[PDB]
């Protein structure tokens, strides 16, 4: 359950360290972003020579939430933190080339195949 | 976008808004007069040449008095 002002960790190596959700995309009055969801972010913390700069406004896909995903059998997969992968603002197309931590099958789509391949787990 | 509220009267405020608009458009569209570049004065050019020629004569007199007529 990511909303505006929620701070997420960055699961790729694009250079960002902490980002803030500034908009849950898709739908008027939409409140939360689950895992496979695209959000608008600003970069609150970045590394000095990274591919992104602090204060940059761009997109991101959620990949891990503390709230977690529920599976059709009722099972739940929760994580110890909310993470996201940064995407280019026009084409999603993840910015980084690595991806840290596990992801979920919820990300198995046509646009996040790069993420599902680069992920070290699930 | 102008906000004119100086006066208790809306008509005064409306004319003040139009006056602000006109003053701003005038100050923003008045063209700065162009600055054509100036050259050294030909008097100064002749001064340069004259100083050069004088030092030329002095340096010609100075230094080496070789041939020696000997």
């Amino acid at each position: 359950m990511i909303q505006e002002q929620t701070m997420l960790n960055v699961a790729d190596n694009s250079g960002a360290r902490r980002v803030m959700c500034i908009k849950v995309l898709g739908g008027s009055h939409r409140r939360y972003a689950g895992v496979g969801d695209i959000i608008k972010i600003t970069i609150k913390e970045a590394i000095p020579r990274g591919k992104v700069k602090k204060g940059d406004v761009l997109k991101a896909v959620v990949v891990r939430t503390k709230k977690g995903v529920r599976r059709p059998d009722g099972s739940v997969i929760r994580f110890d933190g909310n993470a996201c992968v940064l995407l280019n603002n026009n084409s999603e197309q993840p910015i980084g080339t690595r991806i840290f931590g596990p992801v979920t099958r919820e990300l198995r789509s046509e646009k996040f195949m790069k993420i599902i391949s680069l992920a070290p787990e699930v | 976008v102008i906000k004119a509220q100086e006066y208790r009267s809306q008509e005064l405020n409306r004319e003040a808004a139009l006056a602000r608009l006109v003053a701003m458009i005038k100050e923003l569209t008045t063209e700065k007069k162009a600055r054509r570049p100036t050259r050294p004065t030909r008097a100064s050019k002749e001064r340069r040449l004259a100083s050069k020629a004088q030092k030329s004569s002095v340096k010609a007199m100075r230094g080496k008095v070789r041939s020696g007529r000997e």
């Binding site: - | 050019k45 340069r48 100083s51 050069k52 030092k55």
Partner: protein, 123 residues
Amino acid sequence: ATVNQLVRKPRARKVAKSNVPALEACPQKRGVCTRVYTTTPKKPNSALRKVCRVRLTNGFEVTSYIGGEGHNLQEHSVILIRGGRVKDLPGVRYHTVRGALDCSGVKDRKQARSKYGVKRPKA
């Protein structure tokens, strides 16, 4: 004087400064010609000296003289830069190497052709 005073604080040599700092103790450097223009000399001189603002590979942004009569340099020409100031151009401590690396030679030069980068004529 006073060998005792010298034993206390020895004689300090005059550490020389380089007049070609952008070369960084290299014979030549490579640049990009961020600008090509003419300058007036100083002093008593009077001319229109052909000169280029050059960004070097080591990051230095310097000013280099283009010697010889006529050049083909422009706002993005990659050229080679050697030492040597102009002595009547303030701030020009380098020469462009003609006939080397995208800076052409000089037309119709018959004497001192190795300078200005001119190949031997037909003869």
